[PDB]
Design a binder for these strands. Structure first.
Ligand SMILES: [Mg+2]
Length: 831
RNA sequence: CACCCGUGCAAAAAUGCAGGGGUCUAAAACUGAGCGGAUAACCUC
RNA sequence: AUAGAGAGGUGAUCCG
């Protein structure tokens, strides 16, 4: 269940020295200081509108009741008593540390000094989360540019201007000429038609053509170094690269500007023309406000998407206040779409113009409160009794073409302003945001939303912590290398602006004559009907993902692996399966899937042979085959993203512990060194000769491995691991070779229980293929033998090569025990 | 059906009841996840 | 000269 303390409004419980501070929820993510406690003595800080009050205060707990929404009573634990409770021989009361014991080093890196409080560590961890998510969504981008090859993108740095790169053409060193020849080969690929916004430009003659060679190199280099910086841990001045993007060479800035300006120029030029009808009608019904200001407000409402960020579902509000009314009838379907939207502005302006005060009641009652529906019903009730006359007037203002059309050929505009208050061009947006947009040209669909939303959340959290620290009187002055975060408010605004217009995709150019072959190969076809299948397969949203992150001919072969297809169809609900079968073949639920899996695997041209039903049949078959293939590839890529997180964390924590004084060894040649440094064990003659003892458990470097049980399990697993196996596992995960060779690695599978099993079977088979020609250790040989015998992923083998993540117990258990892996498909623990 | 911590009852190294964790994990809370199911709309093939 | 289908924007709709 949700935390009762958060229901009462206790946002956070900070600790500063011998004092503990409690905060409440303000507007949005802002925080308001409420109470301060000094050893059972308390003095409230917010008096104008308290969110909660303390009833009984003891050294080991604080009791609250809350005043807003449901009066829910709750108890909060004193942060100063953490790790200092009963059975600990009554230790002193002190400020807590993070589980990795990296709080002193992390604070000394981002700030100049150690701090006696726990506010700064949360800001540092949010920055770490930003880097973590950038690693995931950057390693996927380079994979897209690697896939089209059917190396260069590694070790590509931003201190090499294209004026220098061209000199490499006649260079006598073969290792450099091969690097240049890789670039020459890359730009001639027809698959560069995909990711159009990053490599193609529009010009009059008008048609789309490739950019110049200079601009293409800048895009590849910028994305290339983003991966290298966000996966490796650079040494020297290069480690602050993302936070010092103002120092880039002129070529990289110009390409970023040109890429960023295209959508902002498209949208901002059509605003008046595309929305003229709505503006005039809204100004007719809202004539009390000046037209010049009023049209500016509508820019905030729709173009900037401000009306959806208010903290509650305005969609639900409108749905609940338009209950059972005649103007919403289907007989006005030609108006209903606009009637809702013009009602939405009437809704949005209310909580800003006049009734801004009482939006707090709605945003707080919902939080303190499933039974949350009646809150919407009550709130929607007042909405009608006030806005009935207003929205009914709009309901007839839109009536008839006499206004829905006369609003266009009137051709009257204010036209007086100099195009101000719009979305900013490239000259005003910071370089950090412009690099995010370039990264999003290569991701697809939900990934864009995930990345942008996560970035917005983390930056907002950083801003809230900074404001709290300003209120408390603490020092926040970042080090000179990290001045990037001082203006976090500015970077938040640009990302919120970006989320409004980012297209979540990049539409391909009008050169689909080349995509004909790929679209035919994805079905294994290779007259007249062929062009129809090509036209339908292309422009299907699920085909865009398949041809970017996969190879068309390889995808068809994996459709022949029956268990992989059968598992995907089981995830589709029973109602949907019935719909497909009704269209695909004009019975038992289980048997319906079996017949469907037979047809999707053996799809041929002959299967595609009045005419209306046959046209509809082929549309269903294409939609089904692409849907199944999209689901399997998406899940495998997302699972592989979980391990790039783990390896990024390993390579970051290695350097973090290096500064703390713990000897770690060279992480490159053996990736299990970090977990050996934490447990205080050292390799000797290639094996761990130190047996288990309770003394080593107590002297562990971090709190995770002070668990007596889990030290033994990890130590037992390290003995079974091998250096080469872990290195090849690292190489496979970061370059996504497990998905690149889905053609071979999935051939002999027997049963797929979840996407965890399917993913780890692909990696283990790849490891078998890689080491079949070389000597292996006895444990690896036993694991390979078990894999061959059972034809399913060996559970013990997973615990072997996932050992470099052992220093973080939670991450180790999540990435080695099935069921604890995915939060959407929970399962029982197996340890 | 993950990890850590506090508290109370039972126990010699541990069990249970009840809580907290933006400082545990992709993981604090407020717009139930939408990843499936298509309609009139301006414009495109 | 005329007739296809997916796109920024909203109803539909099932899921725990
Ligand atoms: Mg966190």
């Amino acid at each position: 269940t949700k935390s009762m303390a958060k229901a009462a409004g206790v946002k956070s419980v900070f600790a500063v020295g011998n004092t503990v501070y409690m905060t409440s929820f303000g507007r949005g993510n802002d925080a308001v200081l409420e109470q301060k406690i000094v050893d059972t003595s308390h003095e409230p800080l917010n008096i104008d509108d308290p969110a909660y009050q303390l009833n009984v205060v003891t050294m080991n707990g604080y009791s609250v009741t809350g005043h807003r929404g449901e009066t829910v009573s709750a108890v909060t634990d004193n942060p100063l008593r953490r790790f200092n409770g009963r059975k600990k021989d009554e230790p002193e009361q002190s400020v807590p540390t993070d589980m990795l014991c990296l709080k002193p080093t992390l604070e000394k890196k981002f700030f100049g000094k150690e701090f006696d409080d726990n506010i700064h560590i949360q800001l540092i961890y949010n920055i770490l989360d930003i880097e973590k998510i950038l690693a995931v969504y950057s390693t996927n981008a380079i994979y897209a540019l690697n896939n089209m090859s059917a190396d260069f993108f590694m070790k590509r740095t931003t201190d090499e201007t294209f004026d220098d790169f061209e000199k490499k053409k006649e260079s006598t060193n073969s290792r450099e000429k091969a690097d240049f020849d890789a670039f020459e080969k890359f730009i001639g690929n027809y698959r560069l038609a995909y990711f159009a916004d990053a490599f193609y430009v529009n010009k009059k003659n008008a048609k789309n053509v490739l950019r110049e060679d200079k601009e293409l190199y800048s895009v590849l280099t910028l994305i290339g170094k983003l991966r290298h910086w966000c996966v490796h841990s650079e040494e020297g001045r290069a480690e602050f690269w993302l936070y010092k993007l103002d120092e880039l060479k002129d070529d990289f800035k110009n390409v970023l500007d040109v890429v960023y300006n295209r959508p902002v120029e498209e949208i901002n030029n059509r605003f008046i023309e595309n929305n003229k009808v709505n503006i005039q009608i809204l100004g007719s019904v809202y004539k009390n406000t000046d037209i010049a200001e009023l049209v500016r407000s509508y820019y905030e409402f729709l173009i900037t998407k401000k009306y959806k960020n208010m903290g509650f579902s305005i969609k639900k509000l409108r749905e609940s206040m338009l209950e059972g009314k005649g103007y919403a009838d289907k007989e006005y379907d030609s108006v209903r779409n606009k009637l809702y939207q013009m009602t939405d502005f009437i809704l949005y302006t209310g909580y800003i113009n006049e009734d801004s005060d009482r939006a707090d009641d709605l945003v707080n009652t919902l939080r303190s409160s499933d039974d949350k529906t009646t809150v919407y019903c009550k709130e929607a009730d007042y909405l009608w009794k006030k806005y009935r006359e207003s929205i009914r007037e709009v309901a007839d203002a839109l009536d008839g073409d006499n206004i829905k059309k006369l609003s266009k050929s009137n051709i009257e505009i204010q036209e007086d302003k100099l195009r101000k208050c719009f979305i900013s061009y490239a000259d005003s947006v910071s370089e950090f945001t412009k690099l995010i947009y370039l990264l999003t040209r290569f991701l697809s669909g939900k990934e864009i939303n995930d990345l942008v939303t996560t970035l917005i959340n983390k930056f907002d959290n950083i801003r809230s912590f900074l404001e709290i620290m300003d209120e408390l009187g603490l020092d926040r002055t970042f080090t000179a290398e990290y001045s990037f975060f001082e203006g976090s408010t500015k970077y938040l605004a640009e990302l919120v602006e970006l989320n409004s217009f980012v297209k979540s995709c990049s539409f391909d150019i009008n050169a689909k004559r080349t995509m004909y072959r790929d679209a035919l190969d994805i079905l294994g076809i290779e007259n007249g009907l062929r062009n129809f299948i090509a036209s339908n397969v292309i422009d299907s949203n699920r085909f865009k993902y398949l041809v970017r992150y996969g190879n068309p001919k390889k995808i068809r072969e994996t459709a022949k692996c029956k268990p992989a297809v059968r598992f995907v169809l089981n995830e589709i609900p029973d109602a949907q399966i019935e719909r497909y079968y009704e269209a695909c073949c004009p019975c038992s639920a289980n048997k319906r899937r079996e017949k469907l899996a037979d047809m999707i695997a053996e799809i041929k041209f002959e299967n595609f042979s009045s005419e209306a039903e046959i046209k509809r049949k082929n549309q269903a078959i294409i939609r089904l085959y692409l849907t199944v293939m999209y689901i399997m590839l998406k899940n495998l890529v997302n699972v592989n993203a979980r391990y790039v997180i783990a390896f990024h964390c390993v390579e970051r924590d290695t350097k973090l512990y290096a500064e703390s004084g713990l000897e770690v060894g060279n992480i490159e040649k053996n990736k299990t060194n970090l977990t050996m440094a934490v447990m205080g064990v050292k390799l000797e003659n290639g094996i761990i000769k130190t047996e288990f003892d309770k003394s080593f458990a107590e002297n562990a470097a971090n709190r995770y491995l002070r668990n007596a049980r889990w030290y033994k399990l990890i130590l037992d697993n390290l003995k079974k691991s091998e250096r080469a196996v872990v290195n090849e596992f690292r190489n496979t995960v970061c370059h996504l070779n497990a998905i690149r060779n889905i053609n071979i690695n999935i051939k002999e599978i027997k049963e797929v229980e979840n996407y965890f099993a399917l993913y780890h079977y692909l990696i283990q088979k790849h490891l078998e293929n890689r080491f079949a020609d070389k000597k292996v250790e006895r444990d690896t040989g036993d694991f390979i033998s078990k894999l061959e015998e059972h034809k399913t992923y060996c559970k013990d083998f997973v615990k072997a090569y996932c050992t470099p993540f052992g220093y973080n117990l939670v991450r180790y258990k999540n990435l080695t025990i099935d069921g604890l892996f995915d939060k959407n498909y929970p399962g029982k623990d197996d340890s």
